[PDB]
PDB file of all heavy atoms in Angstrom:
ATOM      1  N   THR A   1      21.172   3.863   5.628  1.00  0.00           N
ATOM      2  CA  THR A   1      21.313   2.472   6.153  1.00  0.00           C
ATOM      3  C   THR A   1      19.886   1.910   6.446  1.00  0.00           C
ATOM      4  O   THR A   1      19.596   1.589   7.579  1.00  0.00           O
ATOM      5  CB  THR A   1      22.129   2.434   7.461  1.00  0.00           C
ATOM      6  OG1 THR A   1      21.413   3.155   8.536  1.00  0.00           O
ATOM      7  CG2 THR A   1      23.489   3.137   7.160  1.00  0.00           C
ATOM      8  N   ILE A   2      19.109   1.713   5.351  1.00  0.00           N
ATOM      9  CA  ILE A   2      17.715   1.200   5.542  1.00  0.00           C
ATOM     10  C   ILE A   2      17.525   0.147   4.405  1.00  0.00           C
ATOM     11  O   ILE A   2      18.333  -0.009   3.499  1.00  0.00           O
ATOM     12  CB  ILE A   2      16.719   2.304   5.433  1.00  0.00           C
ATOM     13  CG1 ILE A   2      16.805   3.002   4.058  1.00  0.00           C
ATOM     14  CG2 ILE A   2      16.851   3.324   6.541  1.00  0.00           C
ATOM     15  CD1 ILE A   2      16.180   4.448   4.033  1.00  0.00           C
ATOM     16  N   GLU A   3      16.417  -0.575   4.526  1.00  0.00           N
ATOM     17  CA  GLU A   3      16.001  -1.493   3.532  1.00  0.00           C
ATOM     18  C   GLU A   3      14.517  -1.209   3.225  1.00  0.00           C
ATOM     19  O   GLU A   3      13.748  -0.829   4.088  1.00  0.00           O
ATOM     20  CB  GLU A   3      16.175  -2.930   4.050  1.00  0.00           C
ATOM     21  CG  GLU A   3      15.139  -3.357   5.065  1.00  0.00           C
ATOM     22  CD  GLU A   3      15.535  -2.893   6.475  1.00  0.00           C
ATOM     23  OE1 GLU A   3      16.559  -2.106   6.608  1.00  0.00           O
ATOM     24  OE2 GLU A   3      14.844  -3.211   7.437  1.00  0.00           O
ATOM     25  N   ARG A   4      14.179  -1.357   1.921  1.00  0.00           N
ATOM     26  CA  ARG A   4      12.796  -1.131   1.475  1.00  0.00           C
ATOM     27  C   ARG A   4      12.203  -2.444   1.106  1.00  0.00           C
ATOM     28  O   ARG A   4      12.797  -3.187   0.197  1.00  0.00           O
ATOM     29  CB  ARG A   4      12.808  -0.153   0.312  1.00  0.00           C
ATOM     30  CG  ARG A   4      13.075   1.287   0.784  1.00  0.00           C
ATOM     31  CD  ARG A   4      13.136   2.260  -0.372  1.00  0.00           C
ATOM     32  NE  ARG A   4      13.207   3.667   0.062  1.00  0.00           N
ATOM     33  CZ  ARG A   4      14.300   4.251   0.410  1.00  0.00           C
ATOM     34  NH1 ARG A   4      15.500   3.601   0.360  1.00  0.00           N
ATOM     35  NH2 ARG A   4      14.272   5.539   0.787  1.00  0.00           N
ATOM     36  N   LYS A   5      11.062  -2.801   1.597  1.00  0.00           N
ATOM     37  CA  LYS A   5      10.384  -4.032   1.320  1.00  0.00           C
ATOM     38  C   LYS A   5       9.540  -3.796   0.088  1.00  0.00           C
ATOM     39  O   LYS A   5       9.396  -2.721  -0.421  1.00  0.00           O
ATOM     40  CB  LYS A   5       9.644  -4.575   2.543  1.00  0.00           C
ATOM     41  CG  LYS A   5      10.532  -4.881   3.673  1.00  0.00           C
ATOM     42  CD  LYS A   5       9.648  -5.379   4.869  1.00  0.00           C
ATOM     43  CE  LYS A   5       8.699  -6.410   4.456  1.00  0.00           C
ATOM     44  NZ  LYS A   5       7.774  -6.819   5.590  1.00  0.00           N
ATOM     45  N   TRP A   6       8.827  -4.867  -0.386  1.00  0.00           N
ATOM     46  CA  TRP A   6       7.927  -4.746  -1.479  1.00  0.00           C
ATOM     47  C   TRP A   6       6.591  -5.377  -1.118  1.00  0.00           C
ATOM     48  O   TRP A   6       6.579  -6.492  -0.679  1.00  0.00           O
ATOM     49  CB  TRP A   6       8.526  -5.405  -2.738  1.00  0.00           C
ATOM     50  CG  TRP A   6       9.567  -4.620  -3.388  1.00  0.00           C
ATOM     51  CD1 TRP A   6      10.868  -4.412  -2.989  1.00  0.00           C
ATOM     52  CD2 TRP A   6       9.439  -3.865  -4.662  1.00  0.00           C
ATOM     53  NE1 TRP A   6      11.562  -3.588  -3.914  1.00  0.00           N
ATOM     54  CE2 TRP A   6      10.696  -3.290  -4.908  1.00  0.00           C
ATOM     55  CE3 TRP A   6       8.383  -3.676  -5.531  1.00  0.00           C
ATOM     56  CZ2 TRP A   6      10.897  -2.470  -6.033  1.00  0.00           C
ATOM     57  CZ3 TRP A   6       8.594  -2.861  -6.642  1.00  0.00           C
ATOM     58  CH2 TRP A   6       9.883  -2.254  -6.890  1.00  0.00           C
ATOM     59  N   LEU A   7       5.502  -4.616  -1.369  1.00  0.00           N
ATOM     60  CA  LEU A   7       4.182  -5.092  -0.952  1.00  0.00           C
ATOM     61  C   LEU A   7       3.254  -4.980  -2.160  1.00  0.00           C
ATOM     62  O   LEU A   7       3.413  -4.138  -3.041  1.00  0.00           O
ATOM     63  CB  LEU A   7       3.587  -4.267   0.186  1.00  0.00           C
ATOM     64  CG  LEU A   7       4.627  -3.769   1.246  1.00  0.00           C
ATOM     65  CD1 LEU A   7       4.006  -2.731   2.156  1.00  0.00           C
ATOM     66  CD2 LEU A   7       5.105  -4.941   2.060  1.00  0.00           C
ATOM     67  N   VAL A   8       2.264  -5.899  -2.200  1.00  0.00           N
ATOM     68  CA  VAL A   8       1.296  -5.968  -3.301  1.00  0.00           C
ATOM     69  C   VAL A   8      -0.101  -5.936  -2.702  1.00  0.00           C
ATOM     70  O   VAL A   8      -0.425  -6.669  -1.870  1.00  0.00           O
ATOM     71  CB  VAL A   8       1.481  -7.199  -4.155  1.00  0.00           C
ATOM     72  CG1 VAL A   8       1.452  -8.452  -3.359  1.00  0.00           C
ATOM     73  CG2 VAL A   8       0.472  -7.252  -5.205  1.00  0.00           C
ATOM     74  N   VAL A   9      -0.901  -5.018  -3.145  1.00  0.00           N
ATOM     75  CA  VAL A   9      -2.258  -4.733  -2.635  1.00  0.00           C
ATOM     76  C   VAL A   9      -3.175  -4.806  -3.832  1.00  0.00           C
ATOM     77  O   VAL A   9      -2.939  -4.100  -4.844  1.00  0.00           O
ATOM     78  CB  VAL A   9      -2.408  -3.423  -1.895  1.00  0.00           C
ATOM     79  CG1 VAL A   9      -3.647  -3.358  -1.101  1.00  0.00           C
ATOM     80  CG2 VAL A   9      -1.223  -3.181  -0.994  1.00  0.00           C
ATOM     81  N   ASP A  10      -4.266  -5.581  -3.773  1.00  0.00           N
ATOM     82  CA  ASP A  10      -5.243  -5.620  -4.743  1.00  0.00           C
ATOM     83  C   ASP A  10      -6.322  -4.609  -4.484  1.00  0.00           C
ATOM     84  O   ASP A  10      -6.639  -4.284  -3.319  1.00  0.00           O
ATOM     85  CB  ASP A  10      -5.877  -7.040  -4.945  1.00  0.00           C
ATOM     86  CG  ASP A  10      -6.381  -7.609  -3.636  1.00  0.00           C
ATOM     87  OD1 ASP A  10      -6.350  -6.836  -2.603  1.00  0.00           O
ATOM     88  OD2 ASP A  10      -6.897  -8.763  -3.680  1.00  0.00           O
ATOM     89  N   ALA A  11      -6.892  -4.005  -5.539  1.00  0.00           N
ATOM     90  CA  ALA A  11      -7.883  -2.976  -5.458  1.00  0.00           C
ATOM     91  C   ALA A  11      -9.267  -3.445  -5.914  1.00  0.00           C
ATOM     92  O   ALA A  11     -10.031  -2.708  -6.447  1.00  0.00           O
ATOM     93  CB  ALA A  11      -7.479  -1.715  -6.278  1.00  0.00           C
ATOM     94  N   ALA A  12      -9.499  -4.775  -5.652  1.00  0.00           N
ATOM     95  CA  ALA A  12     -10.861  -5.320  -6.038  1.00  0.00           C
ATOM     96  C   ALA A  12     -11.856  -5.076  -4.948  1.00  0.00           C
ATOM     97  O   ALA A  12     -11.687  -5.541  -3.767  1.00  0.00           O
ATOM     98  CB  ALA A  12     -10.708  -6.798  -6.287  1.00  0.00           C
ATOM     99  N   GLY A  13     -12.896  -4.297  -5.200  1.00  0.00           N
ATOM    100  CA  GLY A  13     -13.945  -4.019  -4.254  1.00  0.00           C
ATOM    101  C   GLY A  13     -13.726  -2.810  -3.313  1.00  0.00           C
ATOM    102  O   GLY A  13     -14.640  -2.074  -3.056  1.00  0.00           O
ATOM    103  N   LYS A  14     -12.498  -2.604  -2.889  1.00  0.00           N
ATOM    104  CA  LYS A  14     -12.192  -1.479  -1.968  1.00  0.00           C
ATOM    105  C   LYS A  14     -12.504  -0.103  -2.569  1.00  0.00           C
ATOM    106  O   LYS A  14     -12.353   0.051  -3.814  1.00  0.00           O
ATOM    107  CB  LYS A  14     -10.683  -1.559  -1.552  1.00  0.00           C
ATOM    108  CG  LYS A  14     -10.092  -2.921  -1.334  1.00  0.00           C
ATOM    109  CD  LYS A  14     -10.820  -3.548  -0.073  1.00  0.00           C
ATOM    110  CE  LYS A  14      -9.863  -4.544   0.508  1.00  0.00           C
ATOM    111  NZ  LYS A  14      -9.648  -5.738  -0.401  1.00  0.00           N
ATOM    112  N   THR A  15     -12.985   0.776  -1.760  1.00  0.00           N
ATOM    113  CA  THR A  15     -13.246   2.096  -2.244  1.00  0.00           C
ATOM    114  C   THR A  15     -12.015   2.914  -2.493  1.00  0.00           C
ATOM    115  O   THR A  15     -10.932   2.542  -2.037  1.00  0.00           O
ATOM    116  CB  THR A  15     -14.198   2.822  -1.318  1.00  0.00           C
ATOM    117  OG1 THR A  15     -13.451   3.409  -0.245  1.00  0.00           O
ATOM    118  CG2 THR A  15     -15.238   1.879  -0.711  1.00  0.00           C
ATOM    119  N   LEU A  16     -12.140   3.999  -3.173  1.00  0.00           N
ATOM    120  CA  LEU A  16     -11.063   4.828  -3.599  1.00  0.00           C
ATOM    121  C   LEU A  16     -10.236   5.364  -2.455  1.00  0.00           C
ATOM    122  O   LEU A  16      -9.062   5.050  -2.221  1.00  0.00           O
ATOM    123  CB  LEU A  16     -11.539   5.958  -4.513  1.00  0.00           C
ATOM    124  CG  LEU A  16     -10.486   6.770  -5.338  1.00  0.00           C
ATOM    125  CD1 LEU A  16      -9.573   5.798  -6.044  1.00  0.00           C
ATOM    126  CD2 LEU A  16     -11.167   7.667  -6.325  1.00  0.00           C
ATOM    127  N   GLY A  17     -10.886   6.327  -1.701  1.00  0.00           N
ATOM    128  CA  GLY A  17     -10.181   6.998  -0.607  1.00  0.00           C
ATOM    129  C   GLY A  17      -9.726   6.122   0.502  1.00  0.00           C
ATOM    130  O   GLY A  17      -8.649   6.274   1.102  1.00  0.00           O
ATOM    131  N   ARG A  18     -10.570   5.127   0.874  1.00  0.00           N
ATOM    132  CA  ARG A  18     -10.302   4.262   2.020  1.00  0.00           C
ATOM    133  C   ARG A  18      -9.118   3.381   1.786  1.00  0.00           C
ATOM    134  O   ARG A  18      -8.566   2.784   2.723  1.00  0.00           O
ATOM    135  CB  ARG A  18     -11.546   3.472   2.431  1.00  0.00           C
ATOM    136  CG  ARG A  18     -12.722   4.359   2.708  1.00  0.00           C
ATOM    137  CD  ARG A  18     -13.296   3.936   4.073  1.00  0.00           C
ATOM    138  NE  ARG A  18     -14.511   4.809   4.379  1.00  0.00           N
ATOM    139  CZ  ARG A  18     -14.606   5.473   5.464  1.00  0.00           C
ATOM    140  NH1 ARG A  18     -13.600   5.500   6.403  1.00  0.00           N
ATOM    141  NH2 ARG A  18     -15.723   6.261   5.632  1.00  0.00           N
ATOM    142  N   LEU A  19      -8.693   3.180   0.509  1.00  0.00           N
ATOM    143  CA  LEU A  19      -7.492   2.523   0.152  1.00  0.00           C
ATOM    144  C   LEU A  19      -6.294   3.502  -0.053  1.00  0.00           C
ATOM    145  O   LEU A  19      -5.172   3.181   0.328  1.00  0.00           O
ATOM    146  CB  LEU A  19      -7.699   1.628  -1.002  1.00  0.00           C
ATOM    147  CG  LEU A  19      -6.551   0.943  -1.764  1.00  0.00           C
ATOM    148  CD1 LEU A  19      -6.974  -0.400  -2.334  1.00  0.00           C
ATOM    149  CD2 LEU A  19      -5.958   1.833  -2.846  1.00  0.00           C
ATOM    150  N   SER A  20      -6.570   4.584  -0.722  1.00  0.00           N
ATOM    151  CA  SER A  20      -5.539   5.574  -1.081  1.00  0.00           C
ATOM    152  C   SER A  20      -4.899   6.208   0.193  1.00  0.00           C
ATOM    153  O   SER A  20      -3.690   6.379   0.250  1.00  0.00           O
ATOM    154  CB  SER A  20      -6.137   6.691  -1.890  1.00  0.00           C
ATOM    155  OG  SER A  20      -6.898   6.200  -2.942  1.00  0.00           O
ATOM    156  N   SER A  21      -5.723   6.417   1.209  1.00  0.00           N
ATOM    157  CA  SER A  21      -5.117   6.958   2.510  1.00  0.00           C
ATOM    158  C   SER A  21      -4.112   6.019   3.136  1.00  0.00           C
ATOM    159  O   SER A  21      -3.033   6.365   3.466  1.00  0.00           O
ATOM    160  CB  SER A  21      -6.248   7.271   3.435  1.00  0.00           C
ATOM    161  OG  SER A  21      -5.789   7.259   4.817  1.00  0.00           O
ATOM    162  N   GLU A  22      -4.526   4.679   3.175  1.00  0.00           N
ATOM    163  CA  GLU A  22      -3.581   3.771   3.806  1.00  0.00           C
ATOM    164  C   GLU A  22      -2.353   3.577   2.928  1.00  0.00           C
ATOM    165  O   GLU A  22      -1.216   3.400   3.484  1.00  0.00           O
ATOM    166  CB  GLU A  22      -4.339   2.383   3.928  1.00  0.00           C
ATOM    167  CG  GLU A  22      -3.938   1.538   5.173  1.00  0.00           C
ATOM    168  CD  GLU A  22      -5.043   0.870   5.891  1.00  0.00           C
ATOM    169  OE1 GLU A  22      -6.150   1.476   5.860  1.00  0.00           O
ATOM    170  OE2 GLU A  22      -4.815  -0.168   6.439  1.00  0.00           O
ATOM    171  N   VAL A  23      -2.532   3.541   1.624  1.00  0.00           N
ATOM    172  CA  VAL A  23      -1.389   3.376   0.701  1.00  0.00           C
ATOM    173  C   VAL A  23      -0.388   4.529   0.893  1.00  0.00           C
ATOM    174  O   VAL A  23       0.832   4.409   0.940  1.00  0.00           O
ATOM    175  CB  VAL A  23      -1.830   3.204  -0.704  1.00  0.00           C
ATOM    176  CG1 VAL A  23      -0.656   3.279  -1.636  1.00  0.00           C
ATOM    177  CG2 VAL A  23      -2.484   1.884  -0.892  1.00  0.00           C
ATOM    178  N   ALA A  24      -0.927   5.742   0.964  1.00  0.00           N
ATOM    179  CA  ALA A  24      -0.104   6.939   1.133  1.00  0.00           C
ATOM    180  C   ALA A  24       0.589   6.878   2.509  1.00  0.00           C
ATOM    181  O   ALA A  24       1.795   7.230   2.574  1.00  0.00           O
ATOM    182  CB  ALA A  24      -0.977   8.157   1.077  1.00  0.00           C
TER     183      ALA A  24
END
């Protein structure tokens, strides 16, 4: 009994790990 939203994140400029951690 849950709902899943949809999010869009751009990867322009952001570093690899500092974005991957938040996305995970």
Side-chain angles (χ1 to χ4, degrees):
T1 67
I2 59 199
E3 73 281 4
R4 286 178 173 83
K5 297 176 52 183
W6 283 75
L7 325 167
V8 55
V9 195
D10 53 4
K14 319 294 206 296
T15 82
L16 194 49
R18 301 231 180 239
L19 170 149
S20 312
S21 157
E22 213 141 328
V23 169

